[PDB]
């Protein structure tokens, strides 16, 4: 259905242990496809999915040259960031940047994105209009006016509206078999006693791609939102994901419970129940 391309930058300072480290990873939905680490012997951008390997040499140089330059820039930004917050040159700090475009289920730009963070807290974010900024504090306002004064938002709108979509669509075509294929989850309910009066029903979802999924337990048709322990969706390692939902039911009442699954890989939402095989 819908698709997105996202680049994630992380710059970490480590005083007394060398220069700050810069890593850049690129994604198309939940599939990683590029990586760059300034901490690698001979740092260059590397392929992380089958479909990007066909890209020519000039593509890899264009990429590497950008990320090498970004390594130097984010090193300066980490120093600047100390001034802005009156911080010592002894602490370790992190700057993170998230950016990219969303493609509407047709193929035109649905919305652009570009946020920055300082030590895990929002700093500056490009607004949805791709023309203005939202600075989180007085330090970020310094950055805002520097950006406004240099019309950065302009260059970004052009990337998010042009090149970002062009390439995403290009990657989407080349990686058709996987990028444009949804693998529904395999489902089943397990049962583990926990007392003579209560037992745990656990609904599983495995083998699915993309990561987005919804699991719910209903008792007599009522959602058990506040009673369902849900684990965070995790990666299996084969590109697919796993997730489960559990609820502790009273013994003899397991049939009043249903588990509901919704995934873009399923034509209709699934309902399951415990299947005690006789």
């Amino acid at each position: 259905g819908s698709h997105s391309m996202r680049y994630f930058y992380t710059a970490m300072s480590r005083p007394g242990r060398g220069e700050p480290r810069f890593i850049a990873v690129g994604y198309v939905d939940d599939t990683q496809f590029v990586r760059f680490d300034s901490d690698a012997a001979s740092p260059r951008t590397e392929p992380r999915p089958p479909w990007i390997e066909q890209e020519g040499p000039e593509y890899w140089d264009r990429n590497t040259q950008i990320f090498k330059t970004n390594t130097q820039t984010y090193r300066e930004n980490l120093r600047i960031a100390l001034r802005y917050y009156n911080q010592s040159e002894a602490g370790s700090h992190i700057i993170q940047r998230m950016y990219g475009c969303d493609l509407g289920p047709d193929g035109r730009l649905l919305r652009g994105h570009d946020q920055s963070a300082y030590d895990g807290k929002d700093y500056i974010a490009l607004n949805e209009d791709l023309s203005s900024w939202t600075a989180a504090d007085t330090a970020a306002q310094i950055t805002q006016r520097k950006w406004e004064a240099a019309r950065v938002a302009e260059q970004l709108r052009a990337y998010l509206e042009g090149l970002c979509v062009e390439w995403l669509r290009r990657y989407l075509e080349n990686g058709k078999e996987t990028l444009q294929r949804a693998d529904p989850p395999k489902t089943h309910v397990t049962h583990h006693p926990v007392s003579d009066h209560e037992a745990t029903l656990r609904c599983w979802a495995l083998g699915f791609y993309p990561a987005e999924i919804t699991l719910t337990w209903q008792r007599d048709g009522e959602d058990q939102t506040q009673d369902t322990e849900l684990v965070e969706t995790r990666p299996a390692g084969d590109r697919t994901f796993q997730k489960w939902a559990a609820v502790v039911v009273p013994s003899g009442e397991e049939q009043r419970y249903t588990c509901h699954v919704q995934h873009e890989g399923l034509p209709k939402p699934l309902t399951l129940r415990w299947e005690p095989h006789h």
Partner: peptide, 9 residues
Amino acid sequence: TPYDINQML
């Protein structure tokens, strides 16, 4: 492919 704008704080 990534962007090429000036990201100086």
